[PDB]
């Protein structure tokens, strides 16, 4: 069955990115929408929107490609997963690509990046890495 919706979202993104698709659709949830917001604000995707599906709602994500058809996402990894979950204190927040990437962290103040969490002095669950 489906165990990790977040990992499934990340793999849909990765598979669409590798195939140079301009569009990826998935079932909607608040967590997926929030990490989509973080991705868009960090400039990793072009834009996203939510339609309505036959049963629930869908998530529509536009992938960003450069003028020479070069992908704007180099990698997407799921860090904390069902089973072995990962939590980081405000001081040992992970660095992605030596700071060139973004680590999404679920803190009690919402979804933040590693730099935002470090600035606000909070910890939480390390959802994923983007670079």
């Amino acid at each position: 069955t489906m165990t990790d919706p977040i990992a499934d979202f990340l793999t849909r993104l990765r598979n669409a990115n590798s195939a140079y698709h301009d569009e990826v659709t998935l079932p909607h949830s608040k967590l997926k929408a929030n990490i989509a917001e973080i991705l868009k604000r960090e400039g990793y995707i072009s834009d996203y929107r939510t339609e309505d599906a036959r049963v629930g709602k869908s998530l529509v994500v536009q992938l960003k490609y450069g003028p020479s058809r070069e992908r704007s996402i180099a990698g997407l990894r799921r860090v904390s997963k069902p089973g072995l979950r990962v939590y980081a204190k405000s001081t040992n927040l992970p660095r992605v690509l030596g700071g060139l990437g973004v680590a999404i962290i679920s803190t009690s103040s919402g979804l933040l990046t590693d730099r935002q969490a470090a600035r606000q002095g909070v910890g939480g669950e390390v959802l994923a890495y983007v670079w």
Binding site: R95, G99, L100
Partner: peptide
């Protein structure tokens, strides 16, 4: 390896919002 300027270009952000201050 990716130069930080190219990374900022890919995400369309200023060089400071992408790289750490140490770099």
């Amino acid at each position: 390896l990716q130069r930080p300027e190219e990374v900022a270009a890919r995400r369309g952000l200023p060089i400071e919002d992408v790289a750490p201050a140490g770099m």
